[PDB]
Design a protein around this ligand. Structure first.
Ligand SMILES: COc1ccccc1N1CCN([C@H]2CCCC[C@@H]2NS(=O)(=O)c2ccccc2)CC1
Ligand SMILES: COc1ccccc1N1CCN([C@H]2CCCC[C@@H]2NS(=O)(=O)c2ccccc2)CC1
Ligand SMILES: COc1ccccc1N1CCN([C@H]2CCCC[C@@H]2NS(=O)(=O)c2ccccc2)CC1
Ligand SMILES: COc1ccccc1N1CCN([C@H]2CCCC[C@@H]2NS(=O)(=O)c2ccccc2)CC1
Lengths: 433, 433, 433, 433
């Protein structure tokens, strides 16, 4: 008799792939937490007078402040095993910035020939940048204090070190305790030479299996990903067979007929792309879990795109029924005029973006970059953050009243014009009908 | 002659039930205030260097900080009757965590065999968790200071105690002063082993009538709830009679005819459910006021659902008139296509939710959990918090620019696609008409 | 020939009345500023450890804190002429709270018989409240320190005083320097008996002309308001004449015909109400400027309502032209179905409001009162503060997960149901057409 | 044969002009950063106890606070070369406020005859304002301490000085290091005489080429702007030719025919305006880069308006195709009824604005000025900041409950009325069709 459709295999995919994603997601979350919490601690350990939330406004304004910040950072590094809870370890760095047997590297980076002399208006500068590094060795368990800074020639000051730690959060997830090495860089940046030196701390973790994990009680994830590979490979073969058979029938139709370029359903192309991205992502995740490679951005993006493109196959299966099909056809027929209107709205929107960036960039905090301007305008179209924009512009009414008037006209015209255009677009879409 | 409709009884319900809710609500509000204010005080009494608003970011970062926090908490417990205003009382706890004659319990909870040793990469851990408790007795009106912590093996530190107090706010509401016992637990949590130990304080109140309330001037609430019971029981009987009579007429129609499954109006089912929930909620509230049981979540939920389902009966009574009936029929006929569109929009929305959680979870504060992702997307559809999302993603443009580009594409595509789909859904709903 | 319409008189009104409002508004703004700035200063002068923005969370938590706050307030009152800039004056209060020759009144207010005794669960309280007041005299240019508080019986502590000052901001507005007396009340409120005593400062100003204003260079406002009176009185007479003539014609039509109840245009009723409110408001403003009465709430409300109802007469004059008339008629014919739908939407909205208040009141900050619940739901319908609501509910997912699930269902159902109902209402309004 | 259209020249414009804008924008951004960062530093250098974000609430409340603030500012000016990083230079000011050989000017500004005397209610004031200035000379590398203030007569206190610096950020942009002079004014403002003296710091930069820039490695921008001039001049000539030829044909049509007033396409007028504004802006930018004039507001506004009006020419070129033309014609035919409705909505909106400003101005932070009221109402129409408005009004429910009730009615009526009017406007726009 009539055999049933093997499309149930895809119903497996929507389940199986999704489960994989969830599992991966959970694990990934834990890791990022362990990376973020540590970073917070490092700030509180190494940044003098640091408080939560003061990340972008944290800076030094006097020479004494800079000296105390640097000395506090180095002293807290030297006194880490006594004052810090968390069981960090020194690395005795043998890389490029550190010599063979040094833990911390305080490097002051400044111009070679710099004679800045206001009150006469003369100056000669050689943009070539020299770097002077003082190496400090971890406590056993000295000369960093005698450090001049040359504030007139200063470009930046950087502190580099590393700390090895053991991730004990795995036991909650029944994993074998993971194993980290954090590279910490503290930068006092004087690029602007404006009298304000921002201070920041950044970290980079290098996850690696450590030597002897003698954990008690110490085969499901590894089998799950190969199951994903098998199912996705099966779909690839089946969809490729459909693509070939359809193309053969189209090839005969070419001579027969001798919209014609569209004889293949894009659903199979979507499924093929989903399988390709799921297989690439799952191989990358196999490598990530094995610790042989560390790139969690590409793998997550691939898996998420695969999951989304797989959840559009449910719409594919919904099309079958007439009731859903009518609405889907209405969507499909509405699309082209929407794109056509979007072209003209886009050129007006680009013009407004350029004007807003060039005029309100100096004064408005929300117009600093072109991407920020586009985001602000897009959110303003949908009715978000309108009053905060108006109030941010009102805060500078005392200075450059002409700029304030132009901003008022610009914002009012943009909002009114774009709401009007959407409504007109549709009364056309209710007439054509 | 034609007797008038007894439906006025339901008009009583909408009044009477509502009044009950309001009364209950008012009383409940007072109690929660007395519970929240006390908690705030406890924080300010027991958390060292605590300030309002620093609840999620409150943590300790050095061993000395942890020691001072613990010792300050215990000392403030010991000096409570002298420094604290509010007239709290010790309990001399005789429960499980406290021995017979001890008030406070400082319990340090740590692994049994733990040898964490970075700089060699080896480690052996036994996940079995030992607990060492030091009992402190309330002041009459000692050895807690000699406490090591074992920071390498630490899991958490907990402080348990109780405080009895008298609720004097009742006099405002002309009640007999209520009577509380607060169980306070202060946890320093080192589960992450990340060098940052969050500190928090939680409370649990046990309301109970106390022994001899010799209040001056010391029968309406008790009579009101039984009135609710009578009225709701009456409605149950009347609606059940209607259900039976309709079903008998339907039973004859079955043979006669031998939409057919729908011969009963859902209004009576709604009213029956309302009566059932109001009776259950009012019995539970009787018990709550009598102090025999303490569960204010189920009772409030039941009463609120009953009130809402009772206020839909006003729509029932509005249907009668033709003018309202036409609009109600329009709503009813519009519903099915809305559900049908909601299915496809839902599968696209689930796909987008999974993709956003898996990709932007590590970096974006609004994508930490699947429920949070769904809430963010739902609020983004309606035009809320769009620019804060864009700015939170812009804050991490320097690192992983590929992630930033993907986030831009993802957000723009989601917003544009979903606004487009609503409009297309309706131009279908203006054609079908 | 055909005389032109005297309706130009109303065109005068829209101008003249508006101008009056603007003038009044400007003056009023100055006064409120002088009242608010002073208040801020008083806080910074009299509240110990007070900082801007800490108004609702400012409280005392220990007996020593309360004692220091009270003593600091009294000492700062005693040392005002030496430490405070602003030239305030003592009043030597001769009112009720102050005796003849006392400036400040520190009044502790506590029960008469109060024996609160936890750890035995007994208590006797006499709700009668005694008050003990200590009077302090202004410095010439003593025994307040010996003050017990009786924290177990305490209800509140209040500090009352007054300060006379001269408003010098008038010179900017070319007025004669106005002249204030601020009554300051500082309350430490212990009504909750929860261990947290909120501290707040409130003021009340009594503007009065002072004795001898020998200002240099020292007739337009007074003439302007009588011009408003004349014009508004003229409109009243003219509109009343129209009302009478129309009613006479209607009276004959009654017998002739023997919508019939509507033979008078509501525009004249609107204008009559506008004139009545403008005359009342301008008389009240005459009195306010003369300083004979001090109530700036009624007068401002009357003037604003008059201005709005006068700016609707411009729509009246727009109706004349056919193009505007067609749109206005469309609005008028659309109104009744909107009201009819609003009834049913309102009963569903009231039901949801009651349910949300009763369930999420204890846990959610936005559901504390019924008015707050209604405001939150109304703003949620229009797409505002959705994600902050969801996040505030997410913050309490750990405790009472059933409440969190109910909140999720409640919010999602409310938003989806109400957006659906608006769209259905209109597809009816596009069919009927 | 048929020559191709020279309209490709305009396709050049859209490119070339845009590029210019971007280049200008980038440069401008750098300058404003160098101006803002320095200002921040100056605050942190000269304002005693200043912290980021405390700009509007920063004020002094006691005489000692004012004295310490003034003395700290002057001392930090005197100790700038030793404590400040950034290499600023003294100017030895020879302007009006400074004498020949003085760097800083501390000027106290107060009335001539002022006898403010509360507790008797008398006062005589002479509005003539005397000014007493103390000149301080920069450190070599004294009597400012003996300064009385006359707080009863005080109007304000001002500190004026200048600082020369070298902009070293150019090297990043491969420019020749720019060269600044900042005029700093610190004002302690006592205009209100309310006991609260706001303290603020403002700066004004004067960019000028300095004397001898002996930079190493030291013709594209200058050539680019003249290219813009050539292209825009070409368009002016071509569009003027089209305008003349069209007008000649219209002139003959006048006699022939003897909408008739519209025989010229507004696209050429738009292009002519774009060319005029681009040429003016590019000449102004030439002058700005040459440092001969310093006005970055007019030039940026001109360039942005030119860019926007040039990006509307892409819509001009889109009109050609029929598919886009149909939608554009729908927009054009929809416009007039939108304007006609906007008139009536505007008069209702003006009425509501006046009422809201006059009533809620004293109490609501969002209704301080008419422009602020209009912005708040416009954002409220689109569904933004609704709940913050409601909560700000709820915060003052205890005082003037009548005002709170009026605010509730006003806000609800405004929102409901205006949403209703948009929908009615369109059901008219779906009928007319
Ligand atoms: C992506 O659009 C943009 C993206 C980035 C910046 C500006 C825009 N624009 C151009 C388009 N307009 C949008 C207005 C609000 C939403 C509708 C329009 N999106 S869409 O392109 O037509 C569309 C339709 C269907 C599916 C996918 C996309 C106006 C702003
Ligand atoms: C509940 O919906 C959701 C719930 C949770 C997450 C996602 C969705 N979805 C799916 C549905 N879509 C909604 C878009 C905005 C509002 C209209 C749609 N709600 S509804 O289900 O059709 C509906 C209609 C009538 C009565 C009750 C419900 C799109 C997001
Ligand atoms: C005032 O309405 C309310 C007021 C307070 C609480 C709840 C509501 N409701 C009931 C009405 N609904 C409103 C939904 C959004 C706006 C349209 C509806 N306003 S309106 O009454 O019909 C109307 C129409 C024309 C003129 C004046 C009023 C739904 C919430
Ligand atoms: C600019 O409008 C205003 C400006 C400032 C204050 C108030 C308004 N108003 C009057 C107009 N209404 C607006 C409501 C929301 C948006 C539509 C209406 N803008 S528009 O003028 O008709 C229009 C249409 C097409 C192109 C350019 C403008 C209502 C508030």
């Amino acid at each position: 008799g009539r055999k049933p459709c093997k499309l149930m295999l895809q119903v497996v995919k929507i389940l199986v792939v999704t489960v994989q994603l969830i599992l991966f997601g959970l694990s990934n979350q834990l890791a990022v937490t362990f990376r973020e919490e540590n970073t917070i601690a490092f700030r509180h350990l190494f940044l003098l007078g640091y408080s939560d939330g003061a990340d972008d406004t944290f800076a030094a304004y006097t020479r004494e402040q800079l000296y105390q910040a640097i000395f506090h950072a180095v002293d807290q590094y030297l006194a880490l095993p006594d004052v810090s809870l968390g069981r960090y370890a020194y690395v005795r760095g043998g890389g490029d910035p550190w010599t063979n047997g040094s833990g911390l590297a305080l490097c002051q980076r400044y111009y070679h020939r710099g004679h800045v002399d206001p009150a006469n208006d003369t100056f000669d500068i050689d943009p070539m940048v020299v770097t002077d590094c003082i190496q400090v060795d971890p406590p056993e368990r000295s000369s960093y204090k005698n450090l001049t800074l040359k504030f007139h020639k200063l470009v930046n000051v950087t502190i580099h070190f590393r700390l090895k730690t053991i991730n004990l959060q795995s036991l909650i997830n029944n994993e074998i305790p993971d194993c980290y090495t954090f590279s910490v860089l503290i930068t006092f940046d004087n690029k602007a030479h404006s009298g304000r030196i921002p201070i920041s701390l950044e970290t980079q973790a290098h996850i690696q299996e450590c030597k002897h994990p003698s954990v008690f009680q110490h085969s499901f994830r590894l089998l799950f990903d190969v199951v994903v590979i098998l199912t996705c490979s099966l779909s690839f073969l089946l969809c490729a067979r459909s693509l070939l058979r359809g193309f053969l029938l189209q090839n005969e139709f070419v001579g027969f007929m001798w919209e014609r370029l569209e004889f293949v359903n894009g659903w199979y192309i979507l499924l093929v792309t989903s399988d390709v991205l799921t297989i690439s992502g799952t191989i990358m995740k196999i490598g990530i879990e094995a610790k042989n490679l560390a790139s969690y951005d590409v793998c997550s993006i691939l898996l998420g795109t695969s999951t989304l493109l797989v959840w559009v196959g449910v719409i594919r299966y919904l099309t079958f029924f007439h009731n859903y099909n009518i609405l889907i056809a209405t969507l499909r027929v509405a699309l082209p005029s929407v794109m056509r209107f979007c072209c003209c709205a886009g050129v007006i929107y680009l013009g407004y973006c350029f004007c807003g960036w060039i005029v309100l960039g100096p004064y408005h905090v929300k117009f600093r970059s072109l991407s920020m301007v586009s985001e602000c305008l897009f959110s303003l179209i949908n009715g978000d953050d309108m009053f905060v924009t108006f109030a941010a512009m009102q805060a500078q009414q005392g200075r450059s009243s002409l700029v304030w008037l132009f901003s008022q006209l610009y914002l009012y015209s943009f909002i009114s014009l774009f709401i009007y255009m959407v409504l007109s677009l549709f009364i056309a879409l209710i007439t054509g009908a």
